[PDB]
Amino acid sequence: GIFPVACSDGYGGLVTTDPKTADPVYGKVFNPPRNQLPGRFTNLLDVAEACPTFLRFEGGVPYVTTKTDSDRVLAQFDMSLAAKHMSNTFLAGLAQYYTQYSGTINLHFMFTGPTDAKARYMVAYAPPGMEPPKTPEAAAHCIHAEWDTGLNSKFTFSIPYLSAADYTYTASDVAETTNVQGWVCLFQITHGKADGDALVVLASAGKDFELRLPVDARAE
Amino acid sequence: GIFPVACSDGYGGLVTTDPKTADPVYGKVFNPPRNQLPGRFTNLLDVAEACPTFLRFEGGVPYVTTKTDSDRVLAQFDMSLAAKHMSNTFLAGLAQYYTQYSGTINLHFMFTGPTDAKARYMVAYAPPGMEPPKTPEAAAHCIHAEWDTGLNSKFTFSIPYLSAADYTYTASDVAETTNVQGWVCLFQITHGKADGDALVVLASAGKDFELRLPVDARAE
Amino acid sequence: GIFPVACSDGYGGLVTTDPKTADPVYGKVFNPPRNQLPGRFTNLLDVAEACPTFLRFEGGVPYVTTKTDSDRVLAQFDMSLAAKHMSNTFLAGLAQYYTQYSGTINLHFMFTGPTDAKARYMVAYAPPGMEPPKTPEAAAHCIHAEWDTGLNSKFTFSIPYLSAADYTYTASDVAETTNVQGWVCLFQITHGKADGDALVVLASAGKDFELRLPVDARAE
Amino acid sequence: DKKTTTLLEDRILTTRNGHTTSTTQSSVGVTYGYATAEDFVSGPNTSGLETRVVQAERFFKTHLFDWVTSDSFGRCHLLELPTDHKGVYGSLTDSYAYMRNGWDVEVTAVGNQFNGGCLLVAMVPELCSIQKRELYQLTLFPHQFINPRTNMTAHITVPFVGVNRYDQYKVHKPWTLVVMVVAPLTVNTEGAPQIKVYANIAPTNVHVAGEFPSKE
Amino acid sequence: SGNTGSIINNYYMQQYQNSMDTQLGNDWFSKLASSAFSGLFGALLA
Amino acid sequence: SGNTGSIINNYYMQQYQNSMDTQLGNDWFSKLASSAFSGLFGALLA
Amino acid sequence: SGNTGSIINNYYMQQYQNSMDTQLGNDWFSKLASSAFSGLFGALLA
Amino acid sequence: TTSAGESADPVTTTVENYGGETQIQRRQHTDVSFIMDRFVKVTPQNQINILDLMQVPSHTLVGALLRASTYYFSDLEIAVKHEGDLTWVPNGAPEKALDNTTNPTAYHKAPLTRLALPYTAPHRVLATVYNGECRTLPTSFNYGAIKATRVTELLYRMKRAETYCPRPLLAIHPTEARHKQKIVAPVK
């Protein structure tokens, strides 16, 4: 006799992400050598950590400029990978293809004023549950860092992952009126002749930043 | 119970080049002995290396004849396995069944004039990117060899494989106006009473000549 | 999950000579003992070697009789398993179920005349390519044997297998006018008062006789 | 030539087949085609009844054709083998039903060293006819060239070949000797006016089986 | 044995695949053919 | 490697399942990310 | 050998899958190609 | 290098002659057994079809390469689309045998029948040309025959192929300086 088998209902259809391979039809093909080619990347997050890309501010520019008002807010935006401010970054470009993330996101601030322009800035992370602070004094009670200008033109700060759940969504739901992950608040404490000077801002993935659950969600 | 299996969609159709074998139906057949039969060949390129075959020149002959002009070009042709000059060779007959090749092609030149006819010839390989040389003086700057007649009637020269990619196509595309692999240029430097004498030309595969990717492309 | 399999097209149909067995449905049946039953045969050629059977001559008899002419041919027939002379033999009955054979066929001649009848006979094998000999003198140049009568009534002779190919066909094609395997020629050299006496003829398989490639070719 | 004035040096070759010899002073060597020895001569198809006939292994001769200046590339002369033979080898074909043998072939085209042009001589199995384009690949077969400035003799040695171990030569010819004009003959002022082409051939390792009756 | 050619073991026990033979308490034609006289009965010359 | 998850050996030889790589005579971004400065550039207080 | 690429053993015996070769009592073109002269016939300068 | 051209001794120069370097080659695709081992379609007769590799058209990859050899040997696989049951008989069988189903007969099973068959000729090898009638090949040069109520497609596949004594293999004779054709390429 021969081996009996049960051809099972519910199994066998083609699945677009299945974990098996097709049967081959054309063998013994040897490829031209490509060992040691430059610039290889094997994990997209290595690129996201190593190459910070620009934020986008009002007017379509990657910087905020010194203000000469009583208003000390340089920028305030939703801590969301779907935020307009993050929309031209490599981080947001990658995040749209996953449904959840966890971990640290780093912001970099580079001063580009002349040698005789000085300034002192403050970045603060405001968690959800209360309206974001409008002044450096109210924001002082949040996790925050202050820095001034000098020989080193760049300052980098880690926005911490704080949430009730272990992961948060990369996308933003139409029902959520206020950002579920809080806000990033950038203030100018004061400046000395830095009127009109630009502070360029970039973002990169932190050491424990993680994206999970691939998803193809664009219609165009 | 019995072993459950998933009969998978997308697998199982007959494929003309599949790597499996059919079920047998008529067993225990012993063949008449055929060990040590003469003339066996197991790789078509062994034959291509060992048996040079004739090129074809204007008029349908396998030789070029000494010229008595100021024009010293004996032959100039596209370095292509689809060239008319190579069209009656075993090499071209084999190459039409593969899409790519790499490596060395050898040309052989045999002088057939009488003892009192002498000549000096030059073969040059002109790479793509500039028009082929019209004179031995311009061709001197290319890779080339010169030889004269004497006791040994044959001279053999290797046309080198030089290309941007690791493989080149055996077929020639309708869009490529100038030959993508350059030209073979055969000149007569001078001759002493060799008017009308024939220089027979043959081609064979070199040591590293290689054909890959079988293809059946003829309609007739 | 479960084991995935490719149900392959072109396989699985019932084949009348397939090498596999059916699934059983009624088990544990013990047979009455049959060990040591007499007369078993396990290869049909053992029977063909050990049991010679009769040839058939003109008139439907298994013998040729002494002639008293100048004509010394007792019988001449095609060396073919499809010959009328071999048509009642076990050898021909077996051969019709195979397409090819090779090896030795033995002929046996038994004299049945009285004690006072004496004779001398000759058997010769004439190969294809020339017409068969009509006289013992012309046949002497072929492979042949002569023998006379006496105490032992039987003589046996091996017809050799000689052919260009390693096997010959058991059947005879409608296009072959002259027998492709030659002829068997039986002559009477002379006799002493053996007028009308019968020489009985039989055939058996030789030691290296072999039949191959089973075939079922009868319509009735 | 790889040797050393007139036709010479290690270019002197003497071939012996039986009680016949042939010497040339302008040898270019011998081409062995497909094998350097015969395959088995005693198989099951002759039932150990075959024998060798050494008396047939010797040279016989024939004229092939006259090479003239008007012959152009591709002009060929074909000689199927075995051919008519009026000596011992020929009588074997009338005495035995089955035979096999290889061939030791010498082709000469004697003009002088002031002639030009070139002949290709090849031994081709199972060849009744060939197309013009196929001639460009005649070098796939055991061959040698005859080029007046270098040599006057071509020598090729081949074994018996065939789908069958022994043959019936009255109905099948396994080998065909072909001589083809590659470059036309030139005479100029001092060359021979034409060149007659001759073959000197010897059957090798001659075996026969299946003796025939006489016509008597 | 017979016209069977699978290399792998039958899925069913022998007891089910075929009837089982029993013994109580041998190829005659093979012996008969092997016993055949193949010589020469008298004296041989040359 | 990749999105494949069968524990049993492929039925077809590697030579048939995929093209074969060759070598002549290396993850740049992984090295670049690993080399990132993660400290503090001046003096730290408290 | 040939265009076959399964790693697992054929289910049928060799005796059934193919005809069986026999021997009585060798790649000519491979030897011929290997024997090719690849040098230089006279003296070499520079 | 120079050499005596009259000799058939092969000469294979290399780029090292002028300072180059010979590379490594991988010739698996020109191995005879590998290249012949693939199906090729022939146009079938309605019912009785003699299995004869010379039916493979001479311009096809398999047909041209087979004709580039004088003698050959191989086992065979066939794939057949047919109505009714398909019967095969070996070399040497009377044609009437094709109506008797004890000869290997494959019962119809959609969409086609694929079978492995052994070489069954009485010769040690077969030939693509035979100088007997000097076209026609002896009747014994075949792999048997098949028959079904209707045969609509027939493919041959040579297994374990061996080839002896190479013969001419010709490409297309072009009219222009180079034979040009449309090669597959990303669209407009």
Q: List the one residue out of H60, H28, H46, H15 whose CA is nearest residue H158.
A: H60
Question: What DSSP character marks residue D75?
Answer: -
Question: What DSSP character marks residue C178?
Answer: S
Distance CA A193, CA A208 (A): 39
**Cβ of H165 and D34 within 8 Å?**
yes
Q: From F15, which residue of chain B is nearest by alpha-carbon distance?
A: B19
- Chain G residues with CB under 8 Å of H75 CB are 18-19
Distance CA H62, CA C10 (A): 22
Q: Is C183 in contact with H71 (CB distance < 8 Å)?
A: no
Count CA atoms within 13 Å of residue C84 on its CB side. 8
- Chain G residues with CB under 8 Å of C19 CB are 12-13, 16
Distance CA C95, CA C217 (A): 11
Give the number of domains in chain C.
1
Distance CA B71, CA B65 (A): 13
Backbone angles phi, psi at B136, to 5 degrees: -60, -35
How close, in Å, is residue E28 to chain A by CA atoms?
33
Distance CA B209, CA B104 (A): 5
**Cβ of D40 and G41 within 8 Å?**
no
**DSSP string covering chain B:** --EEEEE-TT-----TT-S--PPB-S---BPPP-TT-TTEESBHHHHHHH--EE--BTTTBSEEE---SS--EEEEEES-TTBGGGTTSHHHHHHTTEEEEES-EEEEEEE-S-TT-EEEEEEEEE-TTSPPPSSHHHHTTSEEEEEE-SS--EEEEEEPP--SSS-EESSEETT-SS-TT-EEEEEEEEEES-TT-EEEEEEEE-TT-EEEEE------
Counting as contact any 3 or more CB pairs under 8 A, the partners of A are B, C, E, F, G, H
- Chain E residues with CB under 8 Å of A4 CB are 11
C26 Cβ neighbours under 8 A, 6+ residues apart: none
**DSSP string covering C77-136:** EES-TTSGGGTTSHHHHHHTTEEEEES-EEEEEEE-S-TT-EEEEEEEEE-TTSPPPSSH
Q: What is the CATH number of domain H1-188?
A: 2.60.120.20
3-state secondary structure at position D45: helix
Torsion sign (Cα): C39, C40, C43, C44: positive
Counting as contact any 3 or more CB pairs under 8 A, the partners of H are A, B, C, D, G
CATH number of the domain enclosing A114: 2.60.120.20
Could you tell me how many CB contacts below 8 A there are between chain B and chain E? Answer: 3
Count CA atoms within 13 Å of residue A105 on its CB side. 24
- Which residue range forms the structural domain that includes residue B23? 1-220
3-state secondary structure at position D114: coil
How close, in Å, is residue E9 to chain B by CA atoms?
17
From D2, D34, D40, residue closest to G28, measured CB to CB: D34
Q: Which residues of H touch D (CB under 8 A)?
A: 3-9, 70-71, 123-127, 129-135, 141, 164-170, 173
D abuts F (3+ Cβ pairs < 8 Å):
no
Count CA atoms within 13 Å of residue A162 on its CB side. 14
Distance CA A150, CA F24 (A): 50
3-state secondary structure at position A50: helix
**Cβ of A30 and B212 within 8 Å?**
yes
Tokens encoding H165: 């004594």
- Chain D residues with CB under 8 Å of G24 CB are 40, 43
Q: List the one residue out of C115, C113, C114, C133 whose CA is nearest residue C124.
A: C133
Backbone angles phi, psi at A87, to 5 degrees: -65, -15
- Give me the amino acid identity at D18: G
3-state secondary structure at position C192: strand
Q: Is H14 on the interface with G (CB under 8 A)?
A: yes
Could you tell me how many CB contacts below 8 A there are between chain A and chain E? Answer: 7
Distance CA H140, CA H136 (A): 11
Q: Is C74 in contact with C144 (CB distance < 8 Å)?
A: no
- Any idea which fold D1-216 has? Jelly Rolls (2.60.120)
Distance CA A85, CA A77 (A): 7
How close, in Å, is residue E22 to chain B by CA atoms?
31
Distance CA F8, CA D199 (A): 69
D abuts E (3+ Cβ pairs < 8 Å):
no
Resolution (A): 1.9
Counting as contact any 3 or more CB pairs under 8 A, the partners of F are A, B, G
Q: How many CB atoms lie within 10 A of CB D85?
A: 17
Distance CA H162, CA H65 (A): 12
Q: Is H12 on the interface with G (CB under 8 A)?
A: yes
Q: From E5, which residue of chain B is nearest by alpha-carbon distance?
A: B27
The C-alpha torsion from C90 through C94 and C95 to C97, rounded to 10°, is 150
Distance CA B206, CA B183 (A): 18
**Is the backbone peptide bond immediately before H111 cis, with ω within 30 degrees of 0?**
yes
Q: How many residues does chain D have?
A: 216
**Cβ of C23 and A12 within 8 Å?**
no
Counting as contact any 3 or more CB pairs under 8 A, the partners of D are B, C, G, H
Ordered by where they begin, the domains of chain E are: 1-46 (4.10.90.10)
**Is the backbone peptide bond immediately before A52 cis, with ω within 30 degrees of 0?**
no
Tokens encoding F36: 């990132």
Distance CA H18, CA C214 (A): 65
Q: How many CB atoms lie within 10 A of CB F18?
A: 15
Pairing mode of beta strands B154-159, H2-3:
antiparallel
- Select the residue from H24, H25, H27, H29 to test the A interface by mutation, using most A Cβ atoms within 10 A: H29
3-state secondary structure at position C138: helix
Burial string for B14-36 (b: 16+ CB within 10 Å, else e) reads beeebbbbbbbbbbebebbbbee
- Give me the amino acid identity at F16: Y
Q: Is H132 on the interface with C (CB under 8 A)?
A: no
**DSSP string covering D125-136:** ET-S---TGGGG
H9 Cβ neighbours under 8 A, 6+ residues apart: D29, G35, G36, G37, H3
**DSSP string covering H67-119:** HTEEEEEEEEEEEEEEES-EEEE-TT--GGGGG-TTSSEEPP-TT-EEEEE--
- Give me the amino acid identity at A165: A
Distance CA G21, CA C213 (A): 15
**DSSP string covering F7-24:** -SPPSB-HHHHSPBP---
Pairing mode of beta strands C198-205, C53-54:
antiparallel
Exposed, middle or buried, B108 (CB in 10 Å: 0-12/13-18/19+)?
A: buried
Between the two ends of chain C, the Cα-to-Cα distance in Å is 57
Q: List the one residue out of D118, D103, D126, D101 whose CA is nearest residue D205.
A: D101
Cα dist from D73 to A217, B85, B200, whole Å: 72, 16, 11
Cα dist from B153 to A179, B115, C120, D27, H57, whole Å: 90, 11, 74, 14, 41
**DSSP string covering A124-164:** EEE-TTSPPPSSHHHHTTSEEEEEE-SS--EEEEEEPP--S
Distance CA C97, CA A17 (A): 57
3-state secondary structure at position D177: strand
Q: From G41, which residue of chain D is nearest by alpha-carbon distance?
A: D2
- Chain C residues with CB under 8 Å of B7 CB are 5-7
Cα dist from H143 to D64, D210, E46, H73, H129, whole Å: 40, 29, 47, 11, 16
A abuts H (3+ Cβ pairs < 8 Å):
yes
Tokens encoding G3: 């265009």
Q: List the one residue out of A40, H69, H186 whose CA is nearest residue B90.
A: H69
Q: In what helix (H) or strand (E) does residue H181 lie, and over which residues does it extend?
A: strand H180-181
